[PDB]
Structure formats: structure tokens, C-alpha cells
Design a protein around this nucleic acid. Structure first.
Lengths: 90, 82
RNA sequence: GGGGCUAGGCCGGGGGGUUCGGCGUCCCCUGUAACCGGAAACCGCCGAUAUGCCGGGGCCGAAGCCCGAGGGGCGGUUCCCGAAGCCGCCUCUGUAAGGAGGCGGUGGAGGGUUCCCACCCUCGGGCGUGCCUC
């Protein structure tokens, strides 16, 4: 699965939205993250969160620490605004 | 269960994330073709869901996502103010 | 108990459609820290021993995987009623290129149900729980 740094992620997420326009669901899922690259038998950083996105076919994700939230917050929010058009308007 | 009122959702969702932040996940499903949106928050024990056709809510959600991100990245989330 | 192996295991799971039938490419519902590339609908790989095929790779490692039952839970689904909204007929209004009923459609908000079910927890089974060395 394509793990990306925030830039390409936002570039790639953009893409997904646009290809599920006449047909398709876009899932975006978000979750506090350990750092885990391996399973848990019978390490951990506490300042990370994970973002996953897919349309069922291609999958992308990225990891966001305190270093980089404050920038990413806005860029992402704007991506959401710009692509989740197409609802009702009162 | 399902919520009709965004506030009642957002408040109860954050309560959950805090109660145990590692177990909880936050999902968003966007459906341009049908023109709906769905948001879920759960720890597999309890599930919380909100569905809309209301473009106003898009912005309401940006804030929710954006805060959750901030809370995830903090050491203890009960020390971050709201 | 420590150090090495290799047997295994994981790298997703459901439902629709379609098929005589099983997987897949299509549509939909859904997970993980977690695969990559290629070909494929009047088609690709199969035959109830079917639950995809070809090529590359990562991780775990005697780890584990399988079966059943119970509970949480998401999306479906069976059947039994049923609300807004719309179409037409006929009353009573009384001039609003309109209203209020009655009637039959159309329609399916929301109940009570049947059978599945991603994801999570517990209990009970099955097979394995090896080799070299210290």
C-alpha cells in the first residue's frame, strides 16, 4: 500500500475524489498511531496519527506528527472543502 | 446509534476517543454520485454514526477531523482544551 | 531460558450482479502497521477435492491456522403492518390559473419480524507446538 509523505498524499487524495464522481465511494479513515511496522507478540511513539484513503481499488495513507499537523490541518481542510462539493445549500 | 444533530454526535464522539484513544477509529465515506456523506466513530464496542446531504456540514466536519488530528498527536488528550 | 534454522502463518473480509456452479475483472458494504506488477465478459483460473490465474517481494516464525457456540456491532435481507410526497375520479367550498374531504392507485418515512454479515470480545473444540546448538 502506497505510504506517502503529506504532499503526494494530498495530491493523490485529490485524485481519488475526482475519479469517484459519476460512480464510486471515497473512504477516509483516521486513527491514533503507535509507529508499528510489525505485529504484537506474546518502541511506541505517542505523537503520531494515521490517515488512510481509498476508493476500493487504490489505497493511500500518511503519517502526521506534531511537527507537521499545524501545516497539514489547513491544507487538508481545504482539500475537503474543494472536493466535497455537490450537496444541498438551503 | 445514529445521530440527527451534529453537535450531539461531535460531543459524544470526542468523549469516546478520549475514553480510549488507541482503540477508537474515525471513518468518513463520501459519495459524489449519490451526493451523500457519512461519518463514523467507534471502538468496536460502541458505534456512533451521522449521515448527511447538507453542504454546510462539510465545514463542520473539517473542524472535527482537524481537532481529532490535534488530539491524536498530543501526549495526554485530556490536557488539550476545547 | 539464550543463539541459530526451517516447516508453516499473515500481507484483508463480506454482499449484489453474472455463472450450471466456485473464485476474479464490474457495482455495493467494510478492516489492517501491512504488499507490488501483469492479463481477464459474450472473458481469466477452476469443478462441490471449485472460495481465482501468472511474476515479483516483505514481515512473523513453531509461530499459528481451522471449526463451532455465545455476546457486542456495521451493512444487507425475508415476510407482516405502515407516515410525508405525488396521479386520477367524485362531493363541499368559492373564484386562490386554488383549498377540505371521500375513494383507488402511486409511494415507502418508521415499526415488528426472518436469514446472512465487515469489525471487536469471551468460552469450547481440531491440527501443529519441530530441528541444530549453548
Amino acid at each position: 500500500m502506497v505510504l506517502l509523505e503529506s504532499e503526494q498524499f494530498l495530491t493523490e487524495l485529490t485524485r481519488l475524489f475526482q475519479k469517484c464522481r459519476t460512480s464510486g465511494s471515497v473512504y477516509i479513515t483516521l486513527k491514533k498511531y503507535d509507529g508499528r511496522t510489525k505485529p504484537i507478540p506474546k518502541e511506541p511513539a505517542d505523537n503520531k496519527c494515521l490517515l488512510r484513503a481509498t476508493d476500493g481499488k487504490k489505497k493511500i495513507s500518511t503519517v502526521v506528527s506534531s511537527k507537521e499537523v499545524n501545516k497539514f490541518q489547513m491544507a487538508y481542510s481545504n482539500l475537503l472543502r474543494a472536493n466535497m462539493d455537490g450537496l444541498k445549500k438551503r | 446509534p445514529q445521530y440527527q444533530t451534529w453537535e450531539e454526535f461531535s460531543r459524544a464522539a470526542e468523549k469516546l476517543y478520549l475514553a480510549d484513544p488507541m482503540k477508537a477509529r474515525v471513518v468518513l465515506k463520501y459519495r459524489h454520485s449519490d451526493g451523500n456523506l457519512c461519518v463514523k466513530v467507534t471502538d468496536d464496542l460502541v458505534c456512533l454514526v451521522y449521515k448527511t446531504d447538507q453542504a454546510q456540514d462539510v465545514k463542520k466536519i473539517e473542524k472535527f477531523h482537524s481537532q481529532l488530528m490535534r488530539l491524536m498527536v498530543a501526549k495526554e488528550a485530556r490536557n488539550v482544551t476545547m
